[PDB]
From Swiss-Prot, chain A:
Keywords: Acetylation, Cytoplasm, Isopeptide bond, Phosphoprotein, Ribonucleoprotein, Ribosomal protein, Ubl conjugation. The modification Phosphoserine is found at residues 11, 53. N-terminally acetylated by acetyltransferase NatA. Also partially acetylated by NatC. The lineage of its organism: Eukaryota, Fungi, Dikarya, Ascomycota, Saccharomycotina. The gene is RPS24A. The chain holds residues 4 to 105 of 135 of the full protein. This is Small ribosomal subunit protein eS24A.
From Swiss-Prot, chain B:
The keyword Nucleus applies. The keyword Methyltransferase does not apply. One of its GO terms (biological process) is maturation of SSU-rRNA. Keywords: Acetylation, Nucleus, Ribonucleoprotein, Ribosome biogenesis, rRNA processing. This is U3 small nucleolar ribonucleoprotein protein LCP5. The gene is LCP5. GO terms for cellular component: nucleolus; small nuclear ribonucleoprotein complex; small-subunit processome; sno(s)RNA-containing ribonucleoprotein complex. The chain holds residues 224 to 357 of 357 of the full protein. It comes from Saccharomyces cerevisiae (strain ATCC 204508 / S288c) (Baker's yeast).
Curated annotation (Swiss-Prot), chain C:
This is Ribosome biogenesis protein BMS1. It comes from Saccharomyces cerevisiae (strain ATCC 204508 / S288c) (Baker's yeast). The lineage of its organism: Eukaryota, Fungi, Dikarya, Ascomycota, Saccharomycotina. Belongs to the TRAFAC class translation factor GTPase superfamily. Bms1-like GTPase family. BMS1 subfamily. Residues 29-38 are annotated as: G5. The chain holds residues 179 to 237 of 1183 of the full protein. Signal peptide: none annotated.
Curated annotation (Swiss-Prot), chain F:
This is Small ribosomal subunit protein eS4A. The gene is RPS4A. The keyword Ribonucleoprotein applies. Present with 573 molecules/cell in log phase SD medium. There are 2 genes for eS4 in yeast. InterPro entries: KOW, Rib_uL2_dom2, Ribosomal_eS4, Ribosomal_eS4_C, Ribosomal_eS4_central_region, Ribosomal_eS4_central_sf, Ribosomal_eS4_KOW, Ribosomal_eS4_N. The lineage of its organism: Eukaryota, Fungi, Dikarya, Ascomycota, Saccharomycotina. There is a cross-link at residues 50, 122, 149, 156, 162, 167, 199, 221 (Glycyl lysine isopeptide (Lys-Gly) (interchain with G-Cter in ubiquitin)). Pfam families: 40S_S4_C, KOW, Ribosomal_S4e, RS4NT, S4. The modification Phosphoserine is found at residue 20. SMART domains: S4 (SM00363). HAMAP family: Ribosomal_eS4 (MF_00485). Gene3D superfamilies: 2.30.30.30, 2.40.50.740, RNA-binding S4 domain (3.10.290.10). It comes from the Eukaryota. Keywords: Cytoplasm, Isopeptide bond, Phosphoprotein, Ribonucleoprotein, Ribosomal protein, RNA-binding, rRNA-binding, Ubl conjugation.
Amino acid sequence: AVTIRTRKVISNPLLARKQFVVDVLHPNRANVSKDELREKLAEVYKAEKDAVSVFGFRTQFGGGKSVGFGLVYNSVAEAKKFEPTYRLVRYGLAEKVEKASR
Amino acid sequence: FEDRFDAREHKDRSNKSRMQAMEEYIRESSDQPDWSASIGADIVNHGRGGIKSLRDTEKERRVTSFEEDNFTRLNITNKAEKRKQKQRERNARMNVIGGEDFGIFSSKRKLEDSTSRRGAKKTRSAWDRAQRRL
Amino acid sequence: SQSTLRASKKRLKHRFWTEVYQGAKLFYLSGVINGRYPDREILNLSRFISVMKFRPLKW
Amino acid sequence: DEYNNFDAGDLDKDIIASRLKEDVAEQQGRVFRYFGDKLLISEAKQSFTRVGENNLTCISCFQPVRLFAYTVSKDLQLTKYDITDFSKRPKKLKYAKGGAKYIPTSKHEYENTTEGHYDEILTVAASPDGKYVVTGGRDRKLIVWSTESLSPVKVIPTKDRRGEVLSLAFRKNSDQLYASCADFKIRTYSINQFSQLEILYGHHDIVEDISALAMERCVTVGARDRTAMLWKIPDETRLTFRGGDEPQKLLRRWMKEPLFFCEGSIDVVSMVDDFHFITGSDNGNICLWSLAKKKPIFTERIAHGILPEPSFNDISGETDEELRKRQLQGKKLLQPFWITSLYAIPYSNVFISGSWSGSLKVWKISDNLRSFELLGELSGAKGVVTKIQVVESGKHGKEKFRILASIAKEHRLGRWIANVSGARNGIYSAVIDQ
Amino acid sequence: SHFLASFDQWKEINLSAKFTEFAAEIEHDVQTLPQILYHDKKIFNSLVSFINFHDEFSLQPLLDLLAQFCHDLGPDFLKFYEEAIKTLINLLDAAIEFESSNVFEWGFNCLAYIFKYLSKFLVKKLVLTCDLLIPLLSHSKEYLSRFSAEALSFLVRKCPVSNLREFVRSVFEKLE
Amino acid sequence: AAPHHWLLDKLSGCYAPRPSAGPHKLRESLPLIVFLRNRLKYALNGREVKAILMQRHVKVDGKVRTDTTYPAGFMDVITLDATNENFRLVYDVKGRFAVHRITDEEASYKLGKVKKVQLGKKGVPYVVTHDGRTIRYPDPNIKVNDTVKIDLASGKITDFIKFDAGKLVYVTGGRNLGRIGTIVHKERHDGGFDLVHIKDSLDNTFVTRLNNVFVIGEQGKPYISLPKG
RNA sequence: UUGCCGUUGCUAUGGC
RNA sequence: UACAGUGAAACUGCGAAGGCUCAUUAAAUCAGUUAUCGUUUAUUUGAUAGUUCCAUGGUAUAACUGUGGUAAU
RNA sequence: UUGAUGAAAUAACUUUUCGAAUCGCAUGGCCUUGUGCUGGCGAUGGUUCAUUCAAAUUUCUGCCCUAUCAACUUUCGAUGGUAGGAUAGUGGCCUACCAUGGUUUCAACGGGUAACGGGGAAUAAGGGUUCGAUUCCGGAGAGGGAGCCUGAGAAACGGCUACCACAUCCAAGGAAGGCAGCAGGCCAAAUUACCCAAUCCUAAUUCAGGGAGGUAGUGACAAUAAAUAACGAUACAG
């Protein structure tokens, strides 16, 4: 099954955050399944599921592992305040559309 | 005359005298082990590459450690990659057989005239050579 | 699949060049937007028509 | 060194290295329990409980931060023991026998999810939280049993035709198991999650022995490649430590003015801290190895002595004693008791070595970590020692240990072992003190 | 339990001078909920001292820890519920003079947390809370009367019609 | 294009930030974007470094001063509130920008090399430093290249460390950006190759320029701390 | 103290 | 029932703040560097304003309306 | 024998600037019997000085051959003083008068290419030993010279006045921008679509932007590693 491993956990309280690198080990699976992985990270730490994000997923040749960048928050308010809009329209709840002209 | 700041006068160049022959001898006679990988994970495009060179795996270690040290994926900057990546894979597939490069034996670069035969401590007096021997 | 679009592009272009003189212009017009073809595509298609150097035949 | 000796980059990296977390599992702590000469030797309570199983194979033990051990036999039987009574024999809690009932009905590789063994359970490992034990052998399976029921709660195959597991090690204080499969493979499993993390390749003969400690590193050794590797499992890299004792040059070292010879096979490991380990070899060598040297720091040439010479009544079948004594060629065919079970108390000054020499040998490494010395001998275990480990009790200044070791009459992998000089099959328990 | 785990995760997340002060004073009062609930009065005196400090960078952790102490006791803050009201109003008015969105967020959050942990077991709530909210009732404020009235709504809808009737009869004589 | 002092690795991007107007120079300053972003890494990029500068955690020179290209140069006492990150920044031995951690005691002060003492208007004594600390009414013996001590709560010169014989020196200039030890010689010329020369572990002797130099303290007692290794 | 068989302890050993 | 939300046209604040072709300049181009008490300097940053005899100051003009000219801005 | 203040106050010009008509947090104090006195606090104001950045002048330092280039410089003053002008100011930078200066064989002045190449201008790339990364070729111009204006910065890429031509409208009276411009080609004439996410710049900004930057699509020069099958059985024939 899908197993997770955090490494190099640092605390950035200036952005009120804790950021780390994620080894995602999936044997005979398709790939990471980012949402289910975020639920697993929400479970392995304190919950904050709409405050946790992972973005830097790179699989390796032949499968097996993937390396990404995880960053858990406290306080979904500052998750909205600091996590940028493109990641928020990917995962969270902000959405911005533009008047495309010219 | 007068003093001018110069990063090229106290900069770590350190590549004008690194030769793979000398480093290969130092690695042979070091008596400290050398952190080889698991034996499958080093070949690249299911074999369509090489295995990969030693310069390649140290550069790759630097890229992934810089990656895990300041959180940034690189790019497809086209002028840079259209020179260096295609030239890198072309010299790799011409010279690197079995993961070991052999271009160092088919390229003119004088080993003694940059790597051995020290220059500052050249011992240009017989008193100096006797003292430095003893 | 823009891959299979490029593949059919190359196949139809070479097979067209075999039947006409080699160097014959194949002009790809995509799907229709609003009843007719895209105006940039029609612009440079008409630009190709705007110079063709018609040579006199016999009959 | 001057008055100004700072580097901006290095003080930056120490700023980040202060800022990070996990000063928890990465303890590169050397030997700190320097108790090699402090404890006694010649008054250990040597209780050998002979148990009714042909050819026991391995022992897993347990301490928390009640106490149970486990045994596993060539008669397909695990048996759990209570060892929490520190001055008597262990007691039987549950037997568990596999056999012909668990041969799969398919003869195909992925559906080897039968709930028992059928051939030669080879090693066993009890969890650091004690919830589970895991055991495996030549049925290319790892079976995880519960503690309180001894049910197989999961069966994970190694999934190839030569997937014999030969040694197991949980890393300390974690739920991650490293099993050294005979496919020149190391498989890693997460036992509370029941998953496989990493497979990792790289040995040259069958990976006969494994050992782990508090960090994610591991040390493995293969049989006849005569190299010992250690693995960074996050980085998936390894250091290779070859042997390298030449009998001709050791003869020259004695010939400066002597039956010591070459090396067949490295057998056993035990990692003593996160900067050294010790390997037991086929010519009775015990070698102590750093993390910064290929060749070993210290070699003890013969550790358990030399096998007895073959008898003149059983060498040829000629009539006269002169020719039957001629057919021994002198000292040319004397071979040593190969060290076949080695154990280190973690971060300690002592370690234990055992074979069919009849006496276990306790040794202590020197304080400078460049040599080691025989402390004493333990003459209460007649037979091959298939596993050694130690159980502790008591606080830092005063502590009492019981060496739990398993004794059989045949080696744990192939038989090969004749001249059973009155050996018995059971658990040797030596309580040493202070 | 989980009080020491939440406190240590908050300590591993955010830390400042007042967090250093609280951790140095009570490094042995994080786990063992029986012992911390025994010596909670010294924790309440240190909480009043850190509220007098009124630190901007170590506020949310200590305020949520005091709310977790009031929740983990749930009956034992009866004596220093008065000092809880006085210190929380003093720090909230200090942050009101500070005028920040995180300041108002933490103030309203701890008000709602103390109301959620204190609105269950109280049926003599209206007179006992109006005894300290008589100063909080009328202070020429656009927002503080709304904050008092919402908490009085939570204290009125969470008791009986006989209880709210006794409350209206008792607070009918302090009315006109 | 990017300067050597900031330890900008070549793996940065394309464009390097030109630091704006402020107290310090162009060549003798690293802005707060390259400070927080890729030197000690409290922010990852421009978006969140502007987010933390709009969250306003920083107290460089005891004030907030919210801008990315604010040229916080030599020994501007950086102070960040969340877990009391107190940093006085110096040069290392190769010209870069070291950041020595201090505490609140050392963060309650800093120094400044004087650059001129003039009699401008209304007879008021006058002293300006590298960070423009126009501070009022010293002793009249504020000499050339002397050093004043800044209170960092007020501006007042609380202590006065003289440029003269037998004081621990600093050098910002020459081929020698940032060495310490100052005792082989005082060779004072009248405008060129004029300096107090500096030692080494083998006590060598070096040549620098006069306004490219100031005094940090005394040989054997600087109270302005220096890192080690 | 077990697959048995024996010396047994009123607990140790030795033969498969 | 003196202003109240969308709101077609104007001013304002700001924006475009840096790119083609042709003849061939030898420390005069360019770089490093000293100085500018010989000097211009918006912006950033630090300081820095004491002369009153016998309840708050006038129209000119946009937008807005209205009449018109011109093929026409 | 050492130690110290220490070798802008006055008499006037001038079409002379201002001593708050900015906003916020705070009911708060004292009985002058009512906004009677309000009064604690912060940013922007605002003169001058300094600082940053930038601009222009200034001494010095930096690979061609150079004498069939040996004399140069007073033939846009040549070299210097004194004074005026104007400059941001010093300044023969222009003007009067005065001196006959000033350089060079220790190489003045004067003549080149591989000055599409060079000057460390600079990234270096762990073997390519001058190929190999980047700043600028020189200075202009917005049809051509001429004259004005704007602005912290301009002799404005995008402002005005007259002349000289190339040009479009046209009701033949009468208004302009400029496109005499640039991208293409002499059997590949389609790049000209998507974002400010990373970098950097401005910003009134817990917003907006930026064809600077970044991303995609065609445009073959047969330059590079695979496949188009592998493993059996049986029968028949010589």
